[PDB]
């Protein structure tokens, strides 16, 4: 029954602030150093901050120095992370982790809480052609929309063989996706959130 | 960060190693810990103090450390070992933990397949907006891990790049795309553009001229 549970995640605008909490159960919380570690979507783990048993020793990653504050309430079995001047690059799942005294290993981790830093508002996509000889590959670049998703087809779903519709990337604060067809060729893009549909004829 | 290979792979029952290369201030001065992260789940402790296993970790996982490098070996590869593995060490210079970039371990369930790469130039329509996006599409690769590098007039690009996480294709191989964003003036200032995709021990480079 040794568990950690983070809470307080959600959507916040750039420049804004958020306070995360981690509740400890089934162990003497005051006997352990505690850490925050984060992971941006599809990226690696990035250590954020750590606090000693009695808050005497506090460390921060250079990436968060002067913006984040770690604290703890030993009576309330709770760890906190106060995040100020939030930037798009702070978007991540934040985990709290317990550190073993003898070994410094993070032996127990919470489930994580997602923090999304974005001022993006509903935006329709701009659609541009992708064009360059054994086989011709044409495509459509569906640029700068929000939120997900967009649906992409070719020739109103009649052209399905040789098509690759790729996952989206966050490029600034907006999404960008591409679709290609290896073959009079039309890409059909639908973005329901902005009530927009685009049909674009692609020529080499 | 600590340097790890993006991908490691083997067939079930095989022995696979994952390297972790650091510097004197971290691995050179402190113990290395390893974390296993199954897709969409929180990391868990795999190895601590270089070579110790917590309860629940099977003996097929072992760790070692020498100089400024550490290594994780997985013997008798099992399908459930498919995950991302990260090494970590305290850095005495930064007074901070440093993690490796992670290695995805694939347990081969089909033969390897090299990526098919296509490079597209920006459209005149986009250029009218004073922006230029080059698109590097990547399909039909297995294991599902690629590293993308871009060059402009032979010089490596350090900014304005985004690469998707790889996703499964209709045929069960993987696909991904990479983007290079420039201003229209920057596009007009240069001539040669290339997208380089590294997959296992295979690198493919596609180029174009403005």
Author numbering:
A (entry chain H): 1 to 132, 145 to 189, 198 to 203, 212 to 218, 231 to 244
B (entry chain L): 3 to 110, 115 to 212, 215 to 218
Task: Quote the paper.
Mcl-1 (myeloid cell leukaemia 1) is a member of the Bcl-2 (B-cell lymphoma 2) family of pro-survival proteins that regulate programmed cell death via apoptosis. Mcl-1 is an anti-apoptotic member of the Bcl-2 family which binds to pro-apoptotic proteins containing the BH3 domain, a short α-helical stretch of around 16 residues. Binding of Mcl-1 to the pro-apoptotic proteins prevents apoptosis. Here, we report the characterization of an antibody fragment produced in vitro against Mcl-1 which was formatted as an scFv and a Fab.
However, when the CHO-Fab was screened in co-crystallization trials with peptide 1, crystals appeared that had not been obtained without the peptide. The Fab VH/VL chains were structurally very similar to those in the CHO-scFv, giving a Cα r.m.s.d. of 0.41 Å. However, no density was observed for the peptide. The CHO-Fab had been screened for crystallization many times over the course of the project and only produced crystals on this occasion. It was therefore assumed that the peptide had some influence on the crystallization, perhaps promoting nucleation.
